[PDB]
Ligand binder design. Sequence first.
Ligand code: HEM
Length: 213
Amino acid sequence: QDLSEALKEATKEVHIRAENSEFMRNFQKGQVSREGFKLVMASLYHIYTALEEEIERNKQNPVYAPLYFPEELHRRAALEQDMAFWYGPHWQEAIPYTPATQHYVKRLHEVGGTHPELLVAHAYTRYLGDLSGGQVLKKIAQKAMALPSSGEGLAFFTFPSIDNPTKFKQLYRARMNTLEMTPEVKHRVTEEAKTAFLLNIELFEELQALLTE
Ligand code: HEM
């Protein structure tokens, strides 16, 4: 069975759980505040920073290399612009770095540094979501918070080098399917994808509590 299918199957249950975290439930209903939106976007800034550091570290490693698409996919630059938008020109000392964010970053560095054959799980969990359901979330954010169609403050959700997210997702899946796969790697990759999802749920749990304190 192809890796792209194996990952979709292995994470469909946990995905349902992630959508129904209290934070995402509120987000999807259009009940996201600037305060809540800033917290989550600052946490993604740290997460994607770590993810992409490790991608760059492993760009030539054949257990990752076919998924090397910085121009199309990388989010760090977009997130910097968003941080300048939401937090102002001194954003680097204004943005929070929460413990649940630190925990996700830590696992990203473990994977990138010690288990790079699992990095695909982490890329899959973030980028394929961003190209799919992230575009729905963009539209809700825009409407909730009166964010302009010109895209300021939502650079994260914008892929100016990808014409068509569906076709690119199909390419990315096809290329995932060219990674050298053994039963051992496949099984652990799908497990790590479930972990990546849990790390995201734990962040959403944490942020909700911080908003409700
Ligand atoms: C309310 C929150 C969310 C909504 C409404 C949402 C919605 C979606 C939608 C509509 C799709 C496309 C499904 C399909 O094409 O069959 C999707 C795919 C995806 N979503 Fe999300 N999602 C949300 C949260 C998340 C979170 C928190 C993660 C990961 C952290 C994520 C990861 C993904 C991934 C990896 C895919 C690709 C599945 C695949 O094709 O293999 N989603 N999601």
